[PDB]
Enzyme design. Structure first.
Site, PDB file in Angstrom:
ATOM      1  N   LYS A 133      -0.582  -7.410  -8.305  1.00 10.11           N
ATOM      2  CA  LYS A 133       0.526  -6.689  -7.666  1.00 10.11           C
ATOM      3  C   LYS A 133       1.816  -7.520  -7.565  1.00 10.11           C
ATOM      4  O   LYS A 133       2.901  -6.950  -7.406  1.00 10.11           O
ATOM      5  CB  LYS A 133       0.099  -6.161  -6.287  1.00 10.11           C
ATOM      6  CG  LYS A 133      -1.029  -5.144  -6.306  1.00 10.11           C
ATOM      7  CD  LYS A 133      -0.808  -3.965  -5.387  1.00 10.11           C
ATOM      8  CE  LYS A 133      -1.490  -2.718  -5.803  1.00 10.11           C
ATOM      9  NZ  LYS A 133      -2.919  -2.794  -5.532  1.00 10.11           N
TER      10      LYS A 133
ATOM     11  N   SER B  20      -0.012  -2.606   3.478  1.00  4.79           N
ATOM     12  CA  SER B  20      -0.266  -3.898   4.134  1.00  4.79           C
ATOM     13  C   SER B  20      -1.269  -4.783   3.396  1.00  4.79           C
ATOM     14  O   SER B  20      -1.532  -5.896   3.853  1.00  4.79           O
ATOM     15  CB  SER B  20      -0.815  -3.711   5.524  1.00  4.79           C
ATOM     16  OG  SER B  20      -1.940  -2.865   5.471  1.00  4.79           O
TER      17      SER B  20
HETATM   18  C1  LIG Z   1      -3.671  -1.967  -6.167  1.00  2.49           C
HETATM   19  C2  LIG Z   1      -4.898  -2.419  -6.803  1.00  2.49           C
HETATM   20  C3  LIG Z   1      -5.518  -1.668  -7.805  1.00  2.49           C
HETATM   21  C4  LIG Z   1      -5.033  -0.305  -8.192  1.00  2.49           C
HETATM   22  O1  LIG Z   1      -3.684  -0.278  -8.737  1.00  2.49           O
HETATM   23  P1  LIG Z   1      -2.884   1.122  -8.698  1.00  2.49           P
HETATM   24  O2  LIG Z   1      -1.596   0.855  -9.385  1.00  2.49           O
HETATM   25  O3  LIG Z   1      -2.740   1.509  -7.263  1.00  2.49           O
HETATM   26  O4  LIG Z   1      -3.768   2.105  -9.501  1.00  2.49           O
HETATM   27  C5  LIG Z   1      -6.652  -2.166  -8.379  1.00  2.49           C
HETATM   28  N1  LIG Z   1      -7.186  -3.364  -8.049  1.00  2.49           N
HETATM   29  C6  LIG Z   1      -6.608  -4.102  -7.104  1.00  2.49           C
HETATM   30  C7  LIG Z   1      -7.205  -5.419  -6.737  1.00  2.49           C
HETATM   31  C8  LIG Z   1      -5.447  -3.656  -6.458  1.00  2.49           C
HETATM   32  O5  LIG Z   1      -4.940  -4.430  -5.496  1.00  2.49           O
END
Ligand SMILES: *Cc1c(COP(=O)(O)O)cnc(C)c1O
Ligand SMILES: *Cc1c(COP(=O)(O)O)cnc(C)c1O
Ligand SMILES: CS(=O)(=O)Cc1nc2ccccc2[nH]1
Ligand SMILES: CS(=O)(=O)Cc1nc2ccccc2[nH]1
Ligand SMILES: [Ca+2]
Ligand SMILES: [Ca+2]
Ligand SMILES: [Ca+2]
Ligand SMILES: [Cl-]
Ligand SMILES: [Mg+2]
Ligand code: NA
EC number: 5.1.1.18
Lengths: 323, 322
Positions: free
Chosen positions: A53, A81
């Protein structure tokens, strides 16, 4: 056409590359032995902040503007969060601007402490959406900040797509990518990227059957969000897909494989025990998908499969309970 | 000259490379920041069987001969249900021979099931060192098999040296290796290899202060084994160094760092949480060494430090204790 293009994904790579890791692709004889396939594991659990992310969060901090009249964000604000809040806070720290996470009064103590631990300011709201929205809008406006949605913000989708640039470069013979899906920021950014560069490579989504809005939307041919908050150990994929990621997923993702809670748990433990990687259970979703019965329908020609191990942010003490 | 030379390590490399993993070297910004050094982690926790011991085990299985007409071992016999026995069992599988583990008749069902899981065949003995030895001798002879010492066997020490051959290629500007030491097969193999190929590179050992025979031996200039079997979370380094590894360690290892139980635990937890690698505590010994006060005083010229993360075979459930 879509809310992002491959150009946006490359702009995002350029914008973030000095501050992220080019995470390794690891292999495992054991998983290669079990699944029938030649697997490759893109290790976003080793990314800065513990998940991919940071890619979309840093792209959003570096490309979004707060206003017509001010080119530089002066703060970042989100209601998310977890991995997104952590990554957005790290991105804001890198750019020298404050981060605010809007949190209901009812959040668990641990959640409040841990947002504090990752360096953001908490702004409280009522557990209602009227409140949450009033509060974040007020904060965004008063701080001259950008609100950065965890999965529907184009700059975030474009950042998460940079995973696929690395995968294609790192695994030139790859045949498919397997991507866990929640809100579909990562799925959609990867799908744009792969289908612009080498559309012969398959893009598959992996989802909990307990939170199966992406599967039901692709089945129905229209966006069908979860009607109720899902219960799943895959905590990172409880968001539904949304209006900006759904058209990409509809048109550019090849297939969706749903997995049960037991399958997610078994795959997670398998990766811990046999690969010695501390993935969070959400990152075990893609591993479960490739082990699943339905994945046997994938053509034997699809041999070289890269699974995104999307995060490693697991609470260790309390996560041995299901193992 | 010693029970091995570098020539033996090169032979081991050719003997084993087609069947082991060339494990990656990973890095960590946070650990760089906590130590003030550029750290490189040689990830033997990802090796086949979950530790580096397959290197020495496979080299032995492909080098040692049974006391029988035919040159090739027809079985492997072990006392170990740990990293060593697991490694030997896999080596036996690669060579298409049975692996037998001698087990007191009073072992718990849990242990027996666990042993069978990795595919060793149990032969029972009575619960004394007498009976264990005698049953292992009988089985090895009747099966035309071999036994393999976990750290003093020259073929094992040579195979462990291959770790360093890889590290020197993967981190060309490395300035030091840090290696957890128990019996010292790994440390001695590595020290032979480093001192042959690039002797300006430092070789440092790390061991629990609760099992500090290597430190005491280097201080005294003579082999001083633990007086009693040590208590340490670092299960895989409870052995003392022996007669074959000691002279190599005496002459070719630059320094020994000892670390307390708490340092081992805190290092192991740090690697889990911040690097997301599931090391066993024994592999956290080397990390704890580089974090320790004593190491902080090591010259800053020794910048690029490769730590061997020697294993990942940890019981997930038992981790609750610490
Ligand atoms: C956010 C997240 C996802 C999913 O990503 P999206 O863009 O919401 O589909 C998968 N694995 C982890 C560890 C995440 O933090
Ligand atoms: C065996 C072992 C060691 C120590 O090796 P010696 O050759 O006995 O010094 C270190 N770490 C792990 C994980 C081990 O299995
Ligand atoms: C992202 S990381 O794991 O923290 C650092 C890293 N990135 C790598 C890429 C290839 C090989 C080893 C690599 N070590
Ligand atoms: C089971 S393993 O040893 O982690 C496989 C492996 N070895 C690598 C070396 C470099 C980069 C990636 C790598 N994946
Ligand atoms: Ca605004
Ligand atoms: Ca879903
Ligand atoms: Ca010792
Ligand atoms: Cl043995
Ligand atoms: Mg739109
Ligand atoms: Na691996």
């Amino acid at each position: 056409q879509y809310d992002i293009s491959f150009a946006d994904v490359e702009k995002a790579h350029i914008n973030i590359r000095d501050s992220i890791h080019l995470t390794p692709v690891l292999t495992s004889s054991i998983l290669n032995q079990l699944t029938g396939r030649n697997l490759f594991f893109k290790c976003e659990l080793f990314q800065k902040t513990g998940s991919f992310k940071i890619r979309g969060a840093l792209n959003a901090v570096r490309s979004l503007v707060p206003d017509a009249l001010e080119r530089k964000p002066k703060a970042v604000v989100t209601h998310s969060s977890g991995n997104h809040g952590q990554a957005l806070t790290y991105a804001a720290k890198l750019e020298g601007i404050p981060a605010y996470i809007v949190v209901p009064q009812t959040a668990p103590d641990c959640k409040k402490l841990a947002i504090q631990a990752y360096g953001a300011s908490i702004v409280y709201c009522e557990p209602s959406d009227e409140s949450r929205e009033n509060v974040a809008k007020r904060v965004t406006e008063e701080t001259e900040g950008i609100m950065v949605h965890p999965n529907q913000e184009p700059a975030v989708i474009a950042g998460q797509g940079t995973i696929a640039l690395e995968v294609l470069n790192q695994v030139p013979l790859v045949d498919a990518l397997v991507v866990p899906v929640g809100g579909g920021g990562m799925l959609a950014g990867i799908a744009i990227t792969v289908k612009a560069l080498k559309p012969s490579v398959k893009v598959y989504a992996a989802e909990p059957s307990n939170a199966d809005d992406c599967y039901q939307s692709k089945l129905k041919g229209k966006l069908m969000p979860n009607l109720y908050p899902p219960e799943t150990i895959a905590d990172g994929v409880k968001s539904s897909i949304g209006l900006n990621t759904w058209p990409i997923i509809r048109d550019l993702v090849d297939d969706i494989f749903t997995v049960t809670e037991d399958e997610i748990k078994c795959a997670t433990q398998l990766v811990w025990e046999r690969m010695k990687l501390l993935i969070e259970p959400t990152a075990g979703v893609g591993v479960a998908a490739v082990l699943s019965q339905h994945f046997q329908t994938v053509s034997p020609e699809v041999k070289n499969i890269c699974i995104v191990l999307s995060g490693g942010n697991v609470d260790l003490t309390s996560s041995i309970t299901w193992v």
